[PDB]
Design a protein around this nucleic acid. Sequence first.
RNA 1: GUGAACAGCCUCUAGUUGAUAGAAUAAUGUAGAUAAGGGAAGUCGGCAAAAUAGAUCCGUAACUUCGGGAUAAGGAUUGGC
RNA 2: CGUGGAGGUCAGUGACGAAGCCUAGACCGUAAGGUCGGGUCGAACGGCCUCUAGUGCAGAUCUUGGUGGUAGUAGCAAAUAUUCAAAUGAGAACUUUGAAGACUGAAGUGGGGAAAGGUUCCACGUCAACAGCAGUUGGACGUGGGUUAGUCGAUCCUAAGA
RNA 3: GAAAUUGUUGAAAGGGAAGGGCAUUUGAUCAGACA
Lengths: 109, 183, 17, 62, 386
Amino acid sequence: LKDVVTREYTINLHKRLHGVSFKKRAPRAVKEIKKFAKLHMGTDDVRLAPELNQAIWKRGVKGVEYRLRLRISRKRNEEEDAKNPLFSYVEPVLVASAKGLQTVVVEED
Amino acid sequence: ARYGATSTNPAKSASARGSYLRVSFKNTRETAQAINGWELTKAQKYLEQVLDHQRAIPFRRFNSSIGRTAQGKEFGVTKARWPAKSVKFVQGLLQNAAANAEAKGLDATKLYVSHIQVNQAPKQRRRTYRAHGRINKYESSPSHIELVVTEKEEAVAKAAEKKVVRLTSRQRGRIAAQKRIAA
Amino acid sequence: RGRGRGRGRGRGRGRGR
Amino acid sequence: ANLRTQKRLAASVVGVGKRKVWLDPNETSEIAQANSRNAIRKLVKNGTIVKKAVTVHSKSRT
Amino acid sequence: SHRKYEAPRHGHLGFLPRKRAASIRARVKAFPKDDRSKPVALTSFLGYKAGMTTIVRDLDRPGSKFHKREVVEAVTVVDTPPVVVVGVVGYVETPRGLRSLTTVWAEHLSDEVKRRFYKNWYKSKKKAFTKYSAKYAQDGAGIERELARIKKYASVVRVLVHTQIRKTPLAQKKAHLAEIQLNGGSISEKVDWAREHFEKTVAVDSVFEQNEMIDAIAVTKGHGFEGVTHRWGTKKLPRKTHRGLRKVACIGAWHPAHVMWSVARAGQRGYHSRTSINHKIYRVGKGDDEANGATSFDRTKKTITPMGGFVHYGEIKNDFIMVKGCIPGNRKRIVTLRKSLYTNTSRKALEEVSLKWIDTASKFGKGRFQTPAEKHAFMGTLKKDL
RNA sequence: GUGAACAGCCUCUAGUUGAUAGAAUAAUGUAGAUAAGGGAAGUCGGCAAAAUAGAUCCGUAACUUCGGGAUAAGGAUUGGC
RNA sequence: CGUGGAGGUCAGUGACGAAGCCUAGACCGUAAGGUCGGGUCGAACGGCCUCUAGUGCAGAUCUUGGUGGUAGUAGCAAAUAUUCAAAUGAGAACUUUGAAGACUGAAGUGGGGAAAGGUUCCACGUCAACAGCAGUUGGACGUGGGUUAGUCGAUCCUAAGA
RNA sequence: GAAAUUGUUGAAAGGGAAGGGCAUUUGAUCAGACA
């Protein structure tokens, strides 16, 4: 069931970085998003866009936003047939504030 | 040549070895003892799960102060680890030993590992620096790895010893007394 | 040798009288 | 590739430090072929290497 | 030589070893002695600790200064949904002790009881008690022959009950099975009382009542590995102490050349089985009646759950027992309430407790309001509602 | 830039991002901290820690080799517009 | 009884296997020891009558060399901090590039010299050893390239002195 | 290409040491005379 789909999620990143060291919050937010994409998509290879890395590191190590609006798209794997046939690409969504939005399935239009 | 103590048929067997490999001797011995006697097709699948931390290698002899885990319940032990460096070397000889099988003409569905042996190699010497201007040794423990895969066979050997009968003069007259009376 | 391994001079340690 | 030596030559040719030398990541094939200082001047002319102007230190609050 | 001065022992030596309990449900080591004249009734009950609140009541204690005066006391709230009898067990007397003889189960068992017998219930075929149900397919002689053996032998009879976990806000989904001894007379009537109660529910007011002194049996809240300073309460070393100060200086003498069992050492703290006695019942509430938190002196329409519900537990919707004082164990823990083993007449009991007010403010902070209508009256109107 | 200041703190030019990592957050530690009421009852011993702290104005004893003691002791003020 | 060598002898043994080594295999002697079978090995060795001595080891905190238990244990925690993508490659937490976040805060982790080191400087190729993890990288390994003065110094003068 | 030390295989034993002496059982193994 490859069934390539693209959805837009809202991750509560405030409750995932609770009681975390101030010099490890931004590095651990990268690891939490890859864990977030593994649960909802099932793929093991999760690629984060460099623009989304700028969003996490916007306000230093101890400056991660409480909520982030993401866009996770599941694609097909190429270039010498790695272990999984599908991977997840996570992109940021430029909105005013990610406060009050739910999951919306974006069709391939 | 000149392998270890093997009791298999050399015609239906294939061998491979590796010398002066810079891997831990204690870590390699536990992985060799956790794979001996297994089928070759199940040996390669089990070693891949160790790299993914799905199954663990049981430590039986060199297991002092090792942290215990829940993955040792399969082998009935408490202390187990995941020696990833030694598995990548052990599975590198399993691929080489399996490749020699089709060259000899062995069907891969029946190969099981029958003999695997690991022993110490000459050490590589370095030095560390301690307090009060002292110098101690700082050495690696390499190992020589060798293994033999053999085809599995069934129904081997009937026709045991003949068990020659020794009878005395009185016992022959006793066994001939029940014969003339009953069965 | 170094600042450790102190045995000899002492305020109230070994090698007294 | 290894463009460590190309960034050192481009710093002295342009006249700024190594922190202000920019190399095109999509054009990394022909930068590795520039081994001399004469070829480094050639890449600046065609925009392969830019100047990467200074960070603004405003004195408006002062 | 002598110490330098005499000092009391640190800790109690009877509570040893301080190891982790063998189960999350504490065992009932003793039961009240049977009286043949009394009717057949339960000796204990099973419930879940919800939380704690505050009660205001009149003190009736002659010779005291607060006589005909109001006092505040801390009480515990234990959610006690009705338990279901699923079987009976008989125990015969042996020179080596008590020995179980015959266990007879009910014909139909709910999925909560079957959840207890499986560790992988989602993967199993749920075949538990399937061939045992064929004993009821006949005229009933297979069960009756096993039941008539309990009337002749088995001088001690215990009943099998389980909690209704689906009636609680917990997400644990598995019933707790336990043995409760029946205290009555005429051993034949004990198994007739249990036979009629198969697949039947008994409430909490049929076992306990108002102003009754009971005992609480539960497992202490765990704390993991703890040092010797908090596990035993030993004196801290001075600030000048090298190699640490939260330790014990002298752990023993030269002779005997061994560490004694009576010295304080670091180890596991908490998660022990404790039995607290002499706890008075202040309220026997109902789950089918509104205004559980109401009183004949307050008259306001409100139930016992605080504002926003109990912290980490939820809301009470079943019968409950209010117990004065503290109860071992934290919230969401299975507890076993047991009647007293002796008749107490110290005048701390035998008094009729009539409350005046029940505190129901929010336990998630410094609550200022009891009912949601009180918050709207004091604060008037807001931007969100209007 | 702040300020008396080559003090501490932040930034520009310039230079680095090199010190084995990952996962959890038991005891005991090392380093940094906070504590109601009492205020040295602790201890060989105020050890350690805490308090005081810049500037301006007021005020300043015994004693003295008349030079000092003296920032004596003890008080008040401090932003922004 | 045994060891190294010497005189005499057994017209001694031996590449059809001397010496040595291994052998819960066998025999003889109270014992020190001697003999045989089997395996391994490849060129010299023994019995006896006498001579001779650097002639017999479990110890000397013995000497030299080698190897263990401890033990995959102690430990690899100062100097605020790294993250994403791409490229290369058998292989990338560590290489290169881009982007982001930071630090040294100008008595600097900046730019130059003296003493000292001596090719560490630069390029290409390489990853067995070294870089107490790793490594495609390196002050590493291999092969080559590089230091241009009438004005900068030495050279000259004298000081304490020699 | 010995010993210390180590791996594999085979055999045997093991309730807070192991090793030893006398005697026998059990298992393995060996010899003699067959005159």
